[PDB]
Amino acid sequence: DSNNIKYVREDAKKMHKLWAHIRMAMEGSRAIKDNAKEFVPHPDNTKATTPEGVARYKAYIERAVWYGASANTVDGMLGQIFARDPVFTGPEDKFDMLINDVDGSGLSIHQQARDSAEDALSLGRGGLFVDYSARPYIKFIAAEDILNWRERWVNGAKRTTLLVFREESDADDDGYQIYKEEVWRELRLVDGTYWQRTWRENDGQLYVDDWISPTKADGSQFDEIPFVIFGSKNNDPTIDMPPMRDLVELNIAHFRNSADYEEACFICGQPTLFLSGLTEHWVKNVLGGAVVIGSRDAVPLPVNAKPELLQAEGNGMVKEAMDQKERQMVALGAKLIDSDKTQRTFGEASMEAAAQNSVLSRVSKNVSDAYTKALRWAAMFLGLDEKIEYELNSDFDINKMSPEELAAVISAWQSNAISFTEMRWQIKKGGRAYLEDEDMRNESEQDDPL
């Protein structure tokens, strides 16, 4: 802490635990079963100290089952948002390099947008730092990497005068060993001028650089820091709670309930004889410490002997507790699991579609705004056209377009009602065309076969 560049804000310390728990939930069952002591407490602390108790706890966690509805939920929401491709408005040839390789790795801007959507859906936070190397690069900053920021009113206007984000990298030596070189970037804004100083670590080092001011095409430095922090709630420096906390908590509860249920299933799921009313004379003389239970041979027992096959029955209260946990997960969720038993009225869901897709639309719009602002900042680096738009798919419930839908969009385009590009965007959205509108135009200009 103190005045070090790596000082982490107190609210980041607020949210680190929840971020780590959500990361465990997304990762799968390996992290959960490795960090089970966080979630599932030992059924007995006195035995938890005892070696037999800790062995019992190891077997107790091993037999448990992790339902894993959280990762499936986030993946489903991602697939709903990222159906087909986002639409980029503006000159494509002037922004072609930004589209194809956003940060010099051959990584398309669409895949980085997908990563942004994933982190905004899971953790509800992220970052898009655009910097100048000549070519602008739009970096991606994880939620736990933004570790400091400030908010000040200057001339009665909200402005961020500081933003510190940690950064990691791989060192190039002659050998093949893998290191982890940590870099700190400090973005400051003094007297309405954007400043940027880089802090480097080598074994815990601080390579301090000069204060430099990146300049636009015409110069004039910058009015605001080229950094945007996006979240589920809004694009604010203030911390936005993740949209996945309730589902993760429900999965944790389901996991501990399943641990108890699996312990019961293993211990008492096997039927047992419980041969009541036996004298040990009988056991030694005829039973001989062994019972043949198959249909071929019959076991004789003395008078007043009541053999009763005993095992726990179904529809247990733990099992139905787990069932209501699953039901609460499905009800308190969006597109997470499918139930083939259940039937739903068509058309009835059209009214609830607005509320069901609430976080989907919120995240799509927030990421679209963040990427639009970053693209505009890169344009100011390159002095390109300012009015550029990056629009993600806000049209959820994507499905193949019906013949009537295609006929309707064609009829609408035949009148001055839908722009031809909009109609082609529709018909690619419905999966009835894949060529670019330009190529289709140049091919269909020539005369028909006949």
Partner 1 sequence: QVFNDWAYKTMSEVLDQQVELFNGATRGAIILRSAGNTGDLSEAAFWAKIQGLVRPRDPYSNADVAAKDLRQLVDNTIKVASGTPPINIPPSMLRWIQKNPQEAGAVIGQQLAGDTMQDMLNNGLAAGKAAFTAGGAVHDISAAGTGLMTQRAFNAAQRIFGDRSTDIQVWVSHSSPLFDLYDNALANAEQLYVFGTVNVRADAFGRPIIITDSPALVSGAAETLRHSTLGLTTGAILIEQNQDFDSTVVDGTGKQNITRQYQAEWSYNLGVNGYAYDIATGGKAPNPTALATAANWDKISTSIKDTGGVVLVTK
From CA 183, how far away is CA 330, in angstroms rounded? Answer: 42
Question: Out of 203, 219, 288, 342, which residue is the one contacting its own copies (CB under 8 A)?
Answer: 342
Determine, following the binding rule CB under 8 A, whether residue 367 of this chain makes contact with its own copies. Answer: no
Determine, following the binding rule CB under 8 A, whether residue 438 of this chain makes contact with its own copies. Answer: no
Determine, following the binding rule CB under 8 A, whether residue 58 of this chain makes contact with partner 1. Answer: yes
From CA 161, how far away is CA 70, in angstroms rounded? Answer: 37
In the complex, what is the shortest distance from the CB of residue 3 to partner 1, in angstroms, rounded to a whole number? 8
In the complex, what is the shortest distance from the CB of residue 269 to partner 1, in angstroms, rounded to a whole number? 22
Interacting positions 249-268 with its own copies (CB under 8 A): 249-250, 253, 256-257, 260-268
Tokens at 287, concatenated: 């039973």
- Residue 331: name its binding partner from partner 1, its own copies, none (Cβ under 5 to 8 Å by kind): its own copies
Interacting positions 99-128 with its own copies (CB under 8 A): 103-108, 111-112, 114-115, 118
- Residue 89: name its binding partner from partner 1, its own copies, none (Cβ under 5 to 8 Å by kind): its own copies
Determine, following the binding rule CB under 8 A, whether residue 359 of this chain makes contact with its own copies. Answer: yes
Question: Out of 204, 219, 294, 314, which residue is the one contacting partner 1 (CB under 8 A)?
Answer: 204
Determine, following the binding rule CB under 8 A, whether residue 13 of this chain makes contact with partner 1. Answer: yes
Determine, following the binding rule CB under 8 A, whether residue 445 of this chain makes contact with its own copies. Answer: yes
From CA 250, how far away is CA 270, in angstroms rounded? Answer: 30
In the complex, what is the shortest distance from the CB of residue 34 to partner 1, in angstroms, rounded to a whole number? 7
In the complex, what is the shortest distance from the CB of residue 232 to its own copies, in angstroms, rounded to a whole number? 9
In the complex, what is the shortest distance from the CB of residue 49 to partner 1, in angstroms, rounded to a whole number? 6
* φ/ψ of residue 160, rounded to 5: -95, 115
Find out whether 220 and 200 touch, Cβ atoms under 8 Å. no
Site mask, its own copies, residues 396-415, x = CB under 8 A?
Answer: xxxxx-xxxxxxxxxxxxxx
From CA 294, how far away is CA 280, in angstroms rounded? Answer: 23
In the complex, what is the shortest distance from the CB of residue 188 to partner 1, in angstroms, rounded to a whole number? 17
> HSE on the CB side for 292, CA within 13 Å?
8
- Residue 182: name its binding partner from partner 1, its own copies, none (Cβ under 5 to 8 Å by kind): none
From CA 72, how far away is CA 220, in angstroms rounded? Answer: 48
Determine, following the binding rule CB under 8 A, whether residue 211 of this chain makes contact with its own copies. Answer: no
**Binding-site residue total for its own copies (CB under 8 A)?**
223
From CA 237, how far away is CA 362, in angstroms rounded? Answer: 17
Determine, following the binding rule CB under 8 A, whether residue 152 of this chain makes contact with partner 1. Answer: no
From CA 369, how far away is CA 390, in angstroms rounded? Answer: 8
From CA 309, how far away is CA 297, in angstroms rounded? Answer: 17
Find out whether 17 and 55 touch, Cβ atoms under 8 Å. no
Determine, following the binding rule CB under 8 A, whether residue 273 of this chain makes contact with its own copies. Answer: yes
Site mask, its own copies, residues 217-246, x = CB under 8 A?
Answer: -------x---x----xxxx----x-x-xx
Alpha-carbon distances of 77 from 60, 72, 107, 144, 287, rounded to whole Å: 33, 9, 22, 22, 63
H or E stretch covering 153: strand 146-154
Q: For the stretch 277-299, what's the b/e string if a residue is b when 16 or more beta carbons lie within 10 angstroms of its beta carbon?
A: eeeeeeeeeebeeeeeeeeeeee
Candidates 122, 81, 147; CA nearest to 368 is 81
Determine, following the binding rule CB under 8 A, whether residue 273 of this chain makes contact with partner 1. Answer: no
Question: Out of 41, 91, 269, 302, which residue is the one contacting partner 1 (CB under 8 A)?
Answer: 41
From CA 229, how far away is CA 259, in angstroms rounded? Answer: 39
From CA 255, how far away is CA 6, in angstroms rounded? Answer: 36
Determine, following the binding rule CB under 8 A, whether residue 6 of this chain makes contact with partner 1. Answer: yes
The site for partner 1 (CB under 8 A) is made up of 1-2, 4, 6-7, 10, 13-14, 16-17, 19-20, 24, 31, 34-35, 37-38, 41-42, 45, 48-49, 51, 54-55, 57-58, 144, 171, 173, 175, 177, 179, 202-208
